[PDB]
Design an enzyme around this catalytic site. Structure first.
Site, mmCIF file in Angstrom:
data_model
loop_
_atom_site.group_PDB
_atom_site.id
_atom_site.type_symbol
_atom_site.label_atom_id
_atom_site.label_comp_id
_atom_site.label_asym_id
_atom_site.label_seq_id
_atom_site.Cartn_x
_atom_site.Cartn_y
_atom_site.Cartn_z
ATOM 1 N N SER A 1 0.782 -1.243 0.000
ATOM 2 C CA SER A 1 0.000 0.000 0.000
ATOM 3 C C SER A 1 0.809 1.285 0.000
ATOM 4 C CB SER A 1 -0.962 0.014 1.190
ATOM 5 O OG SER A 1 -1.877 -1.063 1.114
ATOM 6 N N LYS B 1 0.226 3.599 -2.736
ATOM 7 C CA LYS B 1 -0.895 4.545 -2.683
ATOM 8 C C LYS B 1 -0.434 5.985 -2.643
ATOM 9 C CE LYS B 1 -4.356 1.295 -0.987
ATOM 10 N NZ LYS B 1 -4.315 0.161 -0.047
ATOM 11 N N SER C 1 -6.184 3.497 3.626
ATOM 12 C CA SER C 1 -5.603 2.452 2.764
ATOM 13 C C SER C 1 -6.722 1.644 2.080
ATOM 14 C CB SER C 1 -4.652 1.529 3.556
ATOM 15 O OG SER C 1 -3.712 0.880 2.690
ATOM 16 N N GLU D 1 -4.984 -3.266 -6.510
ATOM 17 C CA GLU D 1 -5.178 -3.842 -5.171
ATOM 18 C C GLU D 1 -6.353 -4.827 -5.223
ATOM 19 O OE1 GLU D 1 -3.257 -3.476 -2.626
ATOM 20 O OE2 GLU D 1 -2.505 -1.428 -2.382
ATOM 21 N N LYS E 1 2.782 6.661 4.952
ATOM 22 C CA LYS E 1 1.891 5.660 4.377
ATOM 23 C C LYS E 1 2.417 4.252 4.699
ATOM 24 C CE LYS E 1 -1.610 4.004 2.353
ATOM 25 N NZ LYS E 1 -1.354 2.915 3.350
ATOM 26 N N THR E 2 1.534 3.389 5.199
ATOM 27 C CA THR E 2 1.872 2.013 5.589
ATOM 28 C C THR E 2 1.600 1.036 4.463
ATOM 29 O OG1 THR E 2 -0.361 1.709 6.499
ATOM 30 C CG2 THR E 2 1.408 2.381 8.014
ATOM 31 N N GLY E 3 2.179 -0.148 4.581
ATOM 32 C CA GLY E 3 1.884 -1.233 3.669
ATOM 33 C C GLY E 3 1.990 -2.565 4.400
ATOM 34 N N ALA E 4 1.269 -3.555 3.896
ATOM 35 C CA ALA E 4 1.309 -4.904 4.437
ATOM 36 C C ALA E 4 1.060 -5.856 3.268
ATOM 37 C CB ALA E 4 0.238 -5.081 5.536
HETATM 38 C C1 LIG Z 1 -1.893 -2.383 1.578
HETATM 39 O O1 LIG Z 1 -0.813 -2.547 2.145
HETATM 40 C C2 LIG Z 1 -3.046 -3.189 1.959
HETATM 41 C C3 LIG Z 1 -2.861 -4.369 2.551
HETATM 42 N N1 LIG Z 1 -3.893 -5.126 2.915
HETATM 43 C C4 LIG Z 1 -3.654 -6.425 3.548
HETATM 44 C C5 LIG Z 1 -3.286 -6.302 5.015
HETATM 45 O O2 LIG Z 1 -3.713 -5.322 5.667
HETATM 46 O O3 LIG Z 1 -2.562 -7.183 5.540
HETATM 47 C C6 LIG Z 1 -4.822 -7.404 3.280
HETATM 48 C C7 LIG Z 1 -6.100 -6.911 3.965
HETATM 49 C C8 LIG Z 1 -4.524 -8.824 3.802
HETATM 50 N N2 LIG Z 1 -3.243 -9.379 3.329
HETATM 51 C C9 LIG Z 1 -1.979 -9.328 3.781
HETATM 52 C C10 LIG Z 1 -1.198 -10.051 2.891
HETATM 53 N N3 LIG Z 1 -1.983 -10.542 1.899
HETATM 54 N N4 LIG Z 1 -3.306 -10.135 2.150
HETATM 55 S S1 LIG Z 1 -5.118 -7.509 1.629
HETATM 56 O O4 LIG Z 1 -5.579 -6.242 1.120
HETATM 57 O O5 LIG Z 1 -3.912 -7.876 0.938
#
Ligand SMILES: *C(=O)/C=C/N[C@@H](C(=O)O)[C@](C)(Cn1ccnn1)[SH](=O)=O
Length: 257
Positions: free
Chosen positions: A40, A43, A98, A134, A202-205
Site C-alpha cells: 500500500s 498509494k 488504505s 489492489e 503511508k503504511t503497507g502490508a
Molecule cells: C496495503 O498494504 C493493503 C494491505 N492489505 C492487507 C493487510 O492489511 O494485511 C490485506 C487486507 C490482507 N493481506 C496481507 C497479505 N496478503 N493479504 S489484503 O488487502 O492484501
C-alpha cells in the site's frame, strides 16, 4: 549496521532502510537497494502522480462505481456505492485508511499501472515496478520484481512529490496534510520518533509478513527527514510485528542524532 542485524534476528525478518536528513545529506542505510513488495505504500506515489495530472477543481469530479467494482477491503468506498465519491474523497480514503477500491479508482484515472510506471520513470525512479491493482499487488513471491521497489527508491520517490518541485507547493501541502492525518501508522514510524516530531506516513502490508512504512518526518527544529522502512519474512503466511518498524526507526533517530 549491527543494531539493525540484531533487529533482524529478534524479529526474524529482513530489513530495508533508507533515511536522509534533507538538511545535512546524512543518510542511514541498511539493505537500501534490496527489493521488497511495496504493498500500500504505492498509494502515496499514486496520489503523487494524480496531483501532477489533476487540478484542485478536477478533484471535485464525482466518480461513480458499482458493487462489482469493490474488492476485499474497502472501509470507505463500500459505504458509497449508491452516491459515488469525488477524487478528493477517494485520495483521502486511499491515503488515510488504505482503501483498496479508492486506490484502484485513482489508478484507473491516471491510466493504470503502466502509466504509473511511466510517470515514475519520468521523475527518475528506475526501480519501482507497478503491474497490478489492489489487493493482488500485495502478493509478491521471492525473486519476483513485479510490484516491488527498494527502501532507497520509495523514499526518493516520496521525497520527490512531497518535498521537491515535482508538485507545486499547494499540492505538496495537500499530499502532506493527508499523510500527516494517516490512521494506519500509530504503531510504526510514529511509535519510534521522539516527542514533538511530526510524521506524515503511508503504511503497507503484504504476503511473506511484509510490513512497510514510508514517511517524511520533521524534528522540532530543522529540515525534514525522508524515511523508508521495509520488511519481509521467509514464510508466505507469516505475521508481521509492528514493533520491528518502531524500533528500527528509533535506531535511525539515534544514528542521525
Ligand atoms: C496495503 O498494504 C493493503 C494491505 N492489505 C492487507 C493487510 O492489511 O494485511 C490485506 C487486507 C490482507 N493481506 C496481507 C497479505 N496478503 N493479504 S489484503 O488487502 O492484501
Amino acid at each position: 549496521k549491527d543494531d539493525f542485524a540484531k533487529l533482524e534476528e529478534q524479529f526474524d525478518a529482513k530489513l530495508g532502510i533508507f533515511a536522509l536528513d534533507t538538511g545535512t545529506n546524512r543518510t542511514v542505510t541498511y539493505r537500501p537497494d534490496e527489493r521488497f513488495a511495496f504493498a500500500s505504500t504505492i498509494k502515496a506515489l499514486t496520489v503523487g502522480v494524480l496531483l501532477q495530472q489533476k487540478s484542485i477543481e478536477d478533484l471535485n469530479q464525482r466518480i461513480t462505481y458499482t458493487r462489482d467494482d469493490l474488492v476485499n477491503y474497502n472501509p470507505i468506498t463500500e459505504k458509497h456505492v449508491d452516491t459515488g465519491m469525488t477524487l478528493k474523497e477517494l485520495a483521502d480514503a486511499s491515503l488515510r485508511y488504505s482503501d483498496n477500491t479508492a486506490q484502484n479508482l485513482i489508478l484507473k484515472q491516471i491510466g493504470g499501472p503502466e502509466s504509473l510506471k511511466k510517470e515514475l520513470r519520468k521523475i527518475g525512479d528506475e526501480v519501482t515496478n507497478p503491474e497490478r491493482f489492489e489487493p493482488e499487488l500485495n502478493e509478491v513471491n521471492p525473486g519476483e520484481t513485479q510490484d516491488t521497489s527498494t527502501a532507497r527508491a520509495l523514499a526518493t520517490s516520496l521525497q520527490a512529490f512531497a518535498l521537491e518541485d515535482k508538485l507545486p507547493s499547494e499540492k505538496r501541502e495537500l499530499l502532506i496534510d493527508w499523510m500527516k492525518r494517516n490512521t494506519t501508522g500509530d504503531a510504526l514510524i510514529r511509535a519510534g520518533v521522539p516527542e514533538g516530531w511530526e510524521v506524515a506516513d503511508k503504511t503497507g502490508a503484504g504476503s511473506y509478513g511484509t510490513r512497510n512504512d514510508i514517511a517524511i518526518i520533521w524534528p522540532p527544529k530543522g529540515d525534514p527527514v525522508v524515511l523508508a522502512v521495509l520488511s519481509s519474512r521467509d514464510k508466505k503466511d507469516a505475521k508481521y510485528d509492528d514493533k520491528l518498524i518502531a524500533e528500527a526507526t528509533k535506531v535511525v533517530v539515534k544514528a542521525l542524532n
